[PDB]
Design a protein around this ligand. Sequence first.
Ligand SMILES: [Mg+2]
Lengths: 120, 167, 138, 18, 101, 132, 99, 194
Amino acid sequence: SLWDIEFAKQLAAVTERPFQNGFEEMIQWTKEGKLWEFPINNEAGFDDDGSEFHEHIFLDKYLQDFPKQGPIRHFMELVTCGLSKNPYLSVKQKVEHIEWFRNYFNEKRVILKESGIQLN
Amino acid sequence: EEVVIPKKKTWDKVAILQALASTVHRDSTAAPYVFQDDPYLIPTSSVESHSFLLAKKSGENAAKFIINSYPKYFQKDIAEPHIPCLMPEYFEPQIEDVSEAALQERIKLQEPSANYNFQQREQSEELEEATEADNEKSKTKAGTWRTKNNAERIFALMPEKNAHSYC
Amino acid sequence: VDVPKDMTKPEITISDEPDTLYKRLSVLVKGHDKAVLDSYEYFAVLAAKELGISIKVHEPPRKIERFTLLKSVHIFKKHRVQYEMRTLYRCLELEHLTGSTADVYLEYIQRNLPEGVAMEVTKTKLEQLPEHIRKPIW
Amino acid sequence: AAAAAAAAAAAAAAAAAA
Amino acid sequence: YYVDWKMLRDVKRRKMAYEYADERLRINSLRKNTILPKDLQEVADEEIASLPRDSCPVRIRNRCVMTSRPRGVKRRWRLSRIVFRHLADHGQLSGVQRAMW
Amino acid sequence: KNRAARVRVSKGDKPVTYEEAHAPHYIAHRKGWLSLHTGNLDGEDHAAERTVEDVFLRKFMLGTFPGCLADQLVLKRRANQLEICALVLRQLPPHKFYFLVGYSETLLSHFYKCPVHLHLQTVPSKVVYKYI
Amino acid sequence: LSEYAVRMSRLSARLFGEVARPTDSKSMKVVKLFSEQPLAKRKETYDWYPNHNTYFALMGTLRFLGLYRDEHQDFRDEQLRLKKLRGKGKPRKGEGKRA
Amino acid sequence: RRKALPPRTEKMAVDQDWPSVYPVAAPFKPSAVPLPVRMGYPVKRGVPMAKEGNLELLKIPNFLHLTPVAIKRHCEALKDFCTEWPAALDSDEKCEKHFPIEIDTADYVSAGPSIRNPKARVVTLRVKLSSLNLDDHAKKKLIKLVGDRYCKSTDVLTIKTDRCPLKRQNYDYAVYLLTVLYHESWKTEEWEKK
Ligand SMILES: [Mg+2]
């Protein structure tokens, strides 16, 4: 409703005022967001999609559609260990990283069968 | 049994800043905070203070005009918390061909609002009681003879709801 | 003479959740010049004394980073200009604090921090024991 | 050579890391 | 405009290196390991060679921001040894002073 | 002969300010730095990001206040908000002073995504320290 | 080195999240490629050069609207005007060589 | 039409409160400071430059808003937000008996538009092995399970977590590792019999 916004702006016209003190300046800018959230922590405004430690450290649940006893597991376990020690990437980026190897291996099927090792 | 753990106190972001502000009251000999404290910039009379405030306001909206007119020079973001009040604003509709999408942009962004209705009614597009209620509110906010022509489009064109008609 | 009345109206509430406890809160204030650090030490010590924290303050050794550049523009390598960067450290060592007391002290400390100095805050959070380890057998 | 079997899912379920 | 055409091309090289950062990271994983058979690694060499030339991070040259000097530039300030002195001697950089010891 | 950040001595009639009257080998000894921030400390980062903004601010303020700038800017950087202390001659009327201060306080804020304070100190003329 | 010790070391890596089964040093490279952010993805690398196009265009536009004053550009314009007045200006594209 | 105004010095009251004059950080405007202060290297026949038009006085940080009277007035208003420290934990000996786990957390501040600092993700956990219910076998297994992160002389186990992007993720990861170490130090497997 536009009339609600009109009533709100009519209220704000008398609520707002040119600043009378530096403390009021900082209060207003903190409510707006310009001033930092004191006490200052380095994780304000970054929630990482509300993820937890088990979504970053344990990526074994994404390795189910791979040969369990083949060298693909030997290589994916190193890939998973590298990604799990990576604080610079979000969970979805690691999901896409695993899916890239997924589709690459499922696309190049002739080479894995020609290499002499039975891979799926 | 010997352990004593007190409770915590939860306050707002500006509660303690207001507490500090309460310790300081208004100064007697000091000029108002919005004005510069240099004597060459301190207002002398009431008309001078009003003129200085108006000149400062002219400066800020002149800057805002440049920011809105050239948004590509302010698209780069440096602050991590991504303050949204410092981003440039856009006064252009997102969709032009779709009638159902042009109205909802042009109502919130005067003459363009009526042009949107004129373009939507050209292709015999059916408008519900919610799309034109805001279009009528747009006219009621800004805007004698054109009002009757607009109001005929309110009742004659569609059986609109009375709750959105009287408002 | 014209003093406003009823100036105080804060929003303070007490929640039932037990307050977090801290054993040592270390503050490392790094700066370029010693006078600002000394004035800040006086300010912080005095502010902690009003709040009853019993701060202990010591000065960690300074760090000087020097590097060397050419003196001329095109060709002169026998003549060089050496530049220096001094970094002085102050240690505000706090003990026996609670979560809200640390929050209010850090408010009054960081909100008035100077422009040319930086601060490193190291909190030693207290915790008795997690849940799956209290007295379990697998 | 020989490989030892480690129960990762059981530990994750027990100590909230699933 | 930019300072120099060399700087112009270096910005393009950096942009395309960032654009292909993920692809090269994934291809190099297939080449830098011994577990996988070499038959797929020889093809991995082919697709990593098929990428455009300016995509590799090796082509990135660290120049000065102001004058785009390809050499004599400090990494901390991304400044040439001449502009850095021109600013420090004027005192526009904090904590920077002539070394006397 | 060293020539960096040094104004040469004339016959004895040039007016020179305190900042220009001291050679760069007097920084932190007799005169202070024109800018203060945390990027130049030991275990801190992001020095170049602030240096480029510093240079841009010097040039932008020099162009914004043409001919009325007495000395160089003092760029303070304190908790996400940057303050600009300037010494300006009283050449422009206060009406035009107040237009430009309000213009800058929003244009710079919207271009750096950080709050900007602008403080002006009006001097009758350029203050002379050494011979004139 | 014993059977008990190697089993303990294998268990330690599995519990801490490290590499469990034995791998070669040349093979640990692929672990490292994902353990940290690549060179092309670091802000210090891909954000090295500020946008001189934005800087130059913004200052030129404010000079044209009369809010910023560029003394260097004024000097260039005055010198070019004197050059065109004395008679050696910039030739049109396509007539310098043949004509 | 030029107009020059005498500064606030002539109107400053002798008993006026200075927190009302300088509540927050200010660029030290000379018209608001009645203190005649001379900063600068003097001339052989001259004197150090006065406060008017002095760039050296503007360069330095001013602590006028942090005068002792103002600090008293500010800290008195903050007493309502703080809570009282329990006297039952005055000495460390009982603190080690009641809360043996120590959590070292790092917080950082820097001037600029940016907040994110990569050093903020590191979380340290320090636990004394003398305050747990490990037996001889589980203790000797845990020592070799942890390796060099246990100090034999001081009997403290340290767990330093960096793998998680966030501080809270590093913290709950660290407590998970503590729980898993405790639970796995208790299980005697088939290969432990050799
Ligand atoms: Mg050139």
